[PDB]
Amino acid sequence: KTYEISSAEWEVMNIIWMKKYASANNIIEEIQMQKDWSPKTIRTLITRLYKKGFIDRKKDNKIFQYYSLVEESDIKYKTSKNFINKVYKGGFNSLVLNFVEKEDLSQDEIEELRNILNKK
Amino acid sequence: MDNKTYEISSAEWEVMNIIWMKKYASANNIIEEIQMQKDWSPKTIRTLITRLYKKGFIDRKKDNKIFQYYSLVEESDIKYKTSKNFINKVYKGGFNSLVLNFVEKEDLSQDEIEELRNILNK
Ligand SMILES: [Cl-]
């Protein structure tokens, strides 16, 4: 639907959804805080996501600024659903049992998650 | 110096979940189980078994004159790690974010909800 998307694309997309509008050079800067990717490798991620229809762009200055054409929450939920079907036999509850049985969740985190369920 | 880290493809997960369910399974046991749900060939399936063996995820003992495959990886550990990477890739690292987006979007009757409450509290 909001179709396939690779690990490195998730990173570009995440920067865009958080910043709302971002230039190439912005994306390169943030990406490069945690990744040793060259500008060309990054610029090619922007190019594909633009071609695939995931993001678009306005020309503020003579400078292109990219923005999402995909709803963040929709593509993340769909992705999570493919993932849960792939790994955990199609059960979200299995995922949570696994996580909880294994992380040493702090009381604040426990409470937050309670607050999340209790919101209907 | 630990062995090379690998990702597991969707079709490798189908194989590994059969291995974990059966504890010990031959190539023929796996082929048959897989074919019940999927139209993949014997060659295809043996290719997945071979890839997982080469990757270190599974090994084999010869009972009778027949290879029997078993996991080298604890199921809950590997699925947790896989979940953590996936949360770090998609959700900025917030498990809370994944749970949130999933409650905002599924239609959950409150008996789905409760077993989650009890996964928390218990
Ligand atoms: Cl699209």
Domain B73-122, second-level architecture: Orthogonal Bundle (1.10)
Q: What is the largest CA-CA distance in chain B?
A: 54
- The residue of chain B with its CA nearest to that of A111 is B120
- Considering only the beta carbons, identify the residue of A7, A80, A96 that sits closest to B116: A96
Give the nearest chain A residue to B87 (CA atoms).
A80
Inter-chain touch A102–B80, beta carbons under 8 Å? yes
Way the structure was solved? X-ray
Residues 6+ apart with CB under 8 A from B12: B48, B51, B52, B57
In this structure, what token pair is assigned to residue A32?
């490069």
Tallying the residues shown for chain B, one arrives at: 122
Which residues does chain B have within 8 Å of residue A83's beta carbon, measured at their own beta carbons? 86
CB contact under 8 A, A83 and B80: no
User: How far is C-alpha B103 from the geometric centre of its chain's CA atoms?
Assistant: 24
Resolution in A: 2.4
Q: Which helix (H) or strand (E) holds A63?
A: strand A63-68
Interface probe, candidates A4, A70, A77, chain B, greatest B C-beta count within 10 A: A77
Domain ranges of chain A: 6-69, 70-120
What's phi and psi for B63, nearest 5 deg?
Answer: -95, 140
| Helix ranges (DSSP H) in chain A | 7-19, 24-34, 39-52, 72-87, 92-102, 107-117
CATH class (in words) of the domain with range B9-72:
mainly alpha
Domain A6-69, CATH 3.40.720.10 — does that match? no
For A70-120, the fitting CATH number among 1.50.10.20, 1.10.4040.10, 3.30.1360.120, 1.10.10.10 is: 1.10.4040.10
Residues bordering ligand 1, an ion, CB closer than 5 Å = A 53
- Given B17, B89, B104, which is nearest A73 (Cβ)? B104
Give, in order, the Cα–Cα distances in Å from B7 to each of A60, B40, B86.
41, 21, 11
Residue in B89, B109, B118 to test binding to A, most A beta-carbons within 10 Å: B89
